[PDB]
């Protein structure tokens, strides 16, 4: 089959930047003077959207900041001035020979200034405790870059192994992330301790920030 | 024109998948190709099958032998069947409509996809708990299988400041997720906040009021 290799596999660029991504096919996708390479954009959770067909033609309605070029084996997609909503994975795809094949994708992330998170802590609901388990949630909201550390403490004792984290995809308007960390304990174990705290480290914070509550 | 896939959800290993895609009725289907394209979780896109106006089929050799694509124009519907399912077959399956460029096809219209999960486990619906209260509030959607769950707030009227987190797979083998929103703290005693949770595999629809 025809193999498509995209470069780079990921990039970070600021709002306004000119972004170029490349696709190299393992053989020519030209036939009779035209080049059968298309490009798609896929935002998180959504289906792909056609941007460019036949190497250089914009699908009608696609914004004019997108353009494509190339021939034979070598193709490029350019975003002339990146917008925050352009965060997505971009795929090339050849329609020259069956089976039609896609590149592995290039993830475009927006670079922006560092922003410390705001931090919120939530005790388990009484409805969950009635059911036998306690989930304690620590939320880090609207921060950049993605890297952050959250450490749980229970009556001051540092915890490990009993929490799980989830991070949002980059936001399409402000280019920040949010993160949740959930500490999970039985109702019996939760009720044996008083102070629950989450301690957050991030580049935008000169020292760690703790949020806590007293059970009850 | 809209393409809407159905038939996703859990399928046993070794079993069969039967998907359908319903196309807006006004649309005429003959000048187009009709395709299935799949995306395993975290991976790229794989074209698997197509059909054209005269019933001619084409299959990716990666699955050829256990796949069939078919059409019922009387319902403006196309179908995919796959047999002998295995783990590589867990994926979002998209239907896509091809348009011509000089005799070849490009995928100009896509459905929104349906997740097929190949697993012997049972479906389980979530519990929904409040994360009570700029202020932050939310809903925790715990212990469901398979994916996905969708969350909206105030029936889709509240969108700014919403973050619905990707689900995490817990050690139990069940998923959990939370959805949070930051709102003006002054708006808290006056405005109602309801999280609308849907887990279609278990026919769970919950509208949970989150109060302070």
Domains of chain A: 11-111 (2.60.40.10), 118-214 (2.60.40.10)
Within a domain: B109:
yes
Residue from A62, A99, A175 to probe the interface with B (highest B Cβ count within 10 Å): A99
Cβ atoms within 10 Å of A130's Cβ, excluding its own: 9
Candidates A93, A88, A42, A47; CA nearest to B111 is A47
- Rounding to the nearest 10 degrees, give the CA dihedral for residues A155, A160, A161, A166: 100
In a domain, B122, yes or no: no
Domain that holds residue B159: 127-209
Please tell me the distance from the alpha carbon of residue B33 to that of residue B56, in angstroms, as a whole number. Answer: 10
Q: Are residues B59 and B143 in the same domain?
A: no
Q: B-side interface with A, Cβ within 8 Å?
A: 44-47, 58-62, 94, 101-102, 104-108, 110-113, 127, 129-132, 134, 136, 138, 140, 142, 163-168, 170, 176-178, 180, 182
| Cis preceding linkage at A198, omega within 30 | no
A203 backbone φψ class: left, alpha, beta (φ>0; ψ -120 to 50) = alpha
Asked if residue B89 and residue B8 are part of one domain, the reply reads yes
CA A147, CA A139: separation in Å to the nearest integer? 14
Do B14 and B58 belong together in one domain? Answer: yes
Q: Using DSSP, how many helices (H) and how many strands (E) does chain A show?
A: 2, 21
Q: Which pair of structure tokens corresponds to residue A118?
A: 């705001």
Cβ-based neighbours of A49, under 8 Å, separated by 6 or more: A40, A41, A42, A43, B110
CB B99, CB B106: distance < 8 Å: yes
B92, B116, B140 — which closes off a domain?
Answer: B116
**Whether residues B24 and B82 fall in one domain:** yes
- CB-side neighbour CA atoms (13 Å) of B95: 29
Q: Do B45 and A102 touch (CB under 8 A)?
A: yes
Cβ-Cβ contacts under 8 Å, A122 against chain B: 131-132, 138
Task: Tell me: do B64 and B143 sit in the same domain.
Answer: no
Any CB–CB contact under 8 A between A106 and chain B? Answer: no
Q: What 3-state class would DSSP assign to A130?
A: helix
Residue B104 and residue B56 share a domain: yes
Contact call for residues A73 and A51 (beta carbons, < 8 A)? no
Method: X-ray
Asked whether residue B82 is domain-assigned, the answer is yes
Q: Which two tokens stand for residue A134?
A: 């306690």
* Residue at B131 is within a domain: yes
Instruction: Give me the CATH number covering residue B171.
Output: 2.60.40.10
Nearest to B129 by CA among B177, B199, B173, B187: B177
Tokens 């783990």 found at: B87
Strand partners, B143: none
A105 CA to chain B: closest CA distance, Å? 7
Instruction: Give A35-102 as a DSSP string.
Output: E-EEEEEE-TTS--EEEEETTTEEPTTS-TTEEEEEETTEEEEEESS--GGG-EEEEEEE-SSSSPEE
Q: Report yes or no: B196 and B151 within 8 Å, Cβ to Cβ.
A: yes
Task: Say yes or no: B167 and B195 in one domain.
Answer: yes
Please judge whether A120 and B94 are an interchain contact, meaning their C-beta atoms are less than 8 angstroms apart. no
Report d(CA A53, CA A59) in Å as an integer. 7
Handedness of CA A80, A84, A86, A87 (dihedral sign): positive
What resolution does the deposited structure have, in angstroms?
A: 1.5
Q: Tell me the C-alpha distance between B204 and B146, whole Å.
A: 12
Q: Same structural domain for residues B109 and B155? A: no
Name the token pair of B206.
Answer: 């919950």
Domain boundary residue among B116, B135, B150?
B116
Tokens of B84: 């002998």
Question: What is residue B126's three-state secondary structure?
Answer: coil
A 10 A CB-CB count for A103 gives 27
- Please identify which residue in the block is written with the tokens 């975290």: B42
Q: Using an 8 Å Cβ cutoff, are B145 and B122 in contact?
A: yes
In chain A, the largest separation of any two C-alpha atoms, in whole Å, equals 76
Reference A41, options A86, A90, A6; nearest CA is A90
C-alpha distances in angstroms, A91 versus B13, B98, B179?
30, 16, 29
Burial code (b: 16+ CB inside 10 Å, e: under 16) for A160-175 equals: eeebeebbbbbbeeeb
- Report how far residue A123's alpha carbon sits from residue A191's, in angstroms, rounded to the nearest whole number: 12
Phi, psi for residue B126 in degrees, rounded to 5: -85, 160
CA–CA distance, A212 with A169 (Å, rounded to integer): 27
- The Cα B25–Cα A77 span in angstroms is 35
Q: Are residues B92 and B154 in the same domain?
A: no
Overall domain count for chain B: 2
Among A residues 127-186, those touching chain B with beta carbons less than 8 Å apart: 127-128, 131, 135, 137, 139, 141, 164-169, 178, 180, 182, 184
Domain boundary among B65, B85, B116: B116
With contact defined as beta carbons under 8 Å apart, do A44 and A62 qualify? no
Contacts B140 to A, Cβ<8 Å: 125, 128, 135, 137, 182
Most B CBs within 10 A among A31, A37, A122, hence the mutation to make, goes to A122
Which two tokens mark B16?
Answer: 């069969």
Residue B30 shares a structural domain with residue B83: yes
Q: Is residue B121 part of a domain?
A: no
Pairing relationship of beta strands A88-94 and A37-42 according to DSSP bridges: antiparallel
Contact between B112 and A101 using a beta-carbon 8 Å cutoff: no
What's the CA gap between B85 and B15, in Å, rounded? 6
| B167, B198: one domain | yes
Cα-Cα-Cα-Cα dihedral sign, residues A138, A144, A145, A146: positive
Task: Determine the Cα–Cα distance for residues A11 and B40; give it in Å rounded to an integer.
Answer: 22
Residues B59 and B109 in one domain: yes
B129 contacts A54? CB cut-off 8 A: no
């Amino acid at each position: 089959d025809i193999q498509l290799t995209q470069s780079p596999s990921s990039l970070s660029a600021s709002v306004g930047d000119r972004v170029t991504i490349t696709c190299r096919a393992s053989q020519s996708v030209d036939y009779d003077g035209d080049s059968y390479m298309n490009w798609y954009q896929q935002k998180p959770g959504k289906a792909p959207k056609l941007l460019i067909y036949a190497a250089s033609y914009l699908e009608s309605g696609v914004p004019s900041r997108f353009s494509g070029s190339g021939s034979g084996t070598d193709f490029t997609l350019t975003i002339s001035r990146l917008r925050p909503e352009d965060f997505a994975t971009y795929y090339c795809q050849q329609s020259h020979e069956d089976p039609y094949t896609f590149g592995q994708g290039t993830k475009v992330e927006i670079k922006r200034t560092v922003a410390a998170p705001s931090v919120f802590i939530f005790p388990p609901s009484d409805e969950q405790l009635k059911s036998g388990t306690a989930s304690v949630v620590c939320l880090l909201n609207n921060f950049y870059p993605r890297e952050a550390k959250v450490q749980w403490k229970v009556d001051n004792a540092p915890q490990s192994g009993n929490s799980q984290e989830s991070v949002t995809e980059q936001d399409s308007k402000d280019s920040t992330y949010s993160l949740s960390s959930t500490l999970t304990l039985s109702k019996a174990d939760y009720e044996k301790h008083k102070v629950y705290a989450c301690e957050v480290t991030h580049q935008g914070l000169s020292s760690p920030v703790t949020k806590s509550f007293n059970r009850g | 024109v809209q393409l809407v896939e159905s038939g996703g959800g859990l399928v046993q290993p070794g079993g069969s998948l039967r998907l359908s895609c319903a196309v807006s009725g006004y649309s005429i289907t003959s000048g187009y190709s009709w395709n299935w394209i799949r995306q395993a979780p975290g991976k790229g896109l794989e074209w698997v099958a197509s059909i054209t106006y005269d019933g001619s089929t084409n299959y990716n050799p990666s699955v050829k032998g256990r796949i069939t694509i078919s059409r019922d124009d009387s319902k403006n519907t196309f179908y995919l069947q796959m047999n002998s399912l295995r783990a590589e077959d867990t994926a979002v399956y998209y239907c896509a409509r091809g348009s011509h460029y000089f005799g070849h096809w490009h995928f100009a219209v896509w459905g929104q996809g349906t997740l097929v999960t190949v697993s012997s486990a049972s479906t389980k619906g979530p519990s929904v708990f409040p994360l009570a209260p700029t202020a932050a509030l939310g809903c925790l959607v715990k212990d469901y299988f398979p994916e996905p769950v969708t969350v909206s707030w105030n029936s889709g009227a509240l969108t700014s400041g919403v973050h619905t987190f990707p689900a995490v797979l817990q050690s139990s083998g069940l998923y959990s997720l939370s959805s949070v929103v930051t709102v003006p703290s002054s708006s808290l005693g006056t405005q109602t906040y309801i999280c609308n949770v849907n887990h279609k595999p278990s026919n769970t629809k919950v509208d949970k009021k989150v109060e302070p």
